[PDB]
Design a protein around this ligand. Structure first.
Ligand SMILES: [K+]
Ligand SMILES: [K+]
Ligand SMILES: [Mg+2]
Ligand SMILES: [Mg+2]
Length: 135
RNA sequence: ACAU
DNA sequence: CGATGT
């Protein structure tokens, strides 16, 4: 119903899918960019969306912040809930890096705790998520 | 179908 | 138009 403005919004950007993947997190209220991942040469949209949320979790925990995270990805929200990214992406030499990051993100979730609410950004009502890349 |  | 996902 109401946007929770005191929150962190994340999103993925890619050139191709699968393709070059990056992600960022912003202050929902102001749009300030709080983190940005160096582009990863081959990944999927959903792996990027998943890593973005987990990074948000790590970022907010490190800073003792109880803010919620918004993501527009139904898929990534569920993967985080499950602590398991069910990506179809082939594992080979050119996807090794993204798969290393995904594996490590799952491992972080399985070894840490958090109370952060992970909320669905309601694109149909509110427009584009504030972390969107605009591609 | 929905979410990207 | 193509792909990633539940
Ligand atoms: K975009
Ligand atoms: K589809
Ligand atoms: Mg998105
Ligand atoms: Mg976007």
């Amino acid at each position: 119903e109401e946007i929770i403005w005191e929150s962190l919004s994340v999103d993925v950007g890619s050139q191709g899918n699968p393709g070059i993947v990056e992600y960022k997190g912003v202050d929902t209220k102001t749009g300030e960019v709080l983190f940005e991942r160096e582009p990863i040469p081959i990944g999927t949209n959903n792996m990027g969306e998943f890593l973005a949320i987990v990074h948000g979790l790590r970022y907010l925990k490190e800073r003792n912040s109880r803010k919620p995270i918004y993501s527009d990805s139904q898929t990534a929200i569920k993967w985080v809930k499950d602590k398991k990214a069910k990506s179809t992406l082939v594992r080979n030499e050119e996807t090794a890096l993204i798969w290393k990051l995904v594996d490590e993100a799952e491992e972080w979730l399985n070894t840490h705790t958090y109370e952060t609410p992970i909320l669905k950004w309601q694109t149909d009502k509110w427009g584009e998520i504030k972390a969107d890349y605009g591609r």
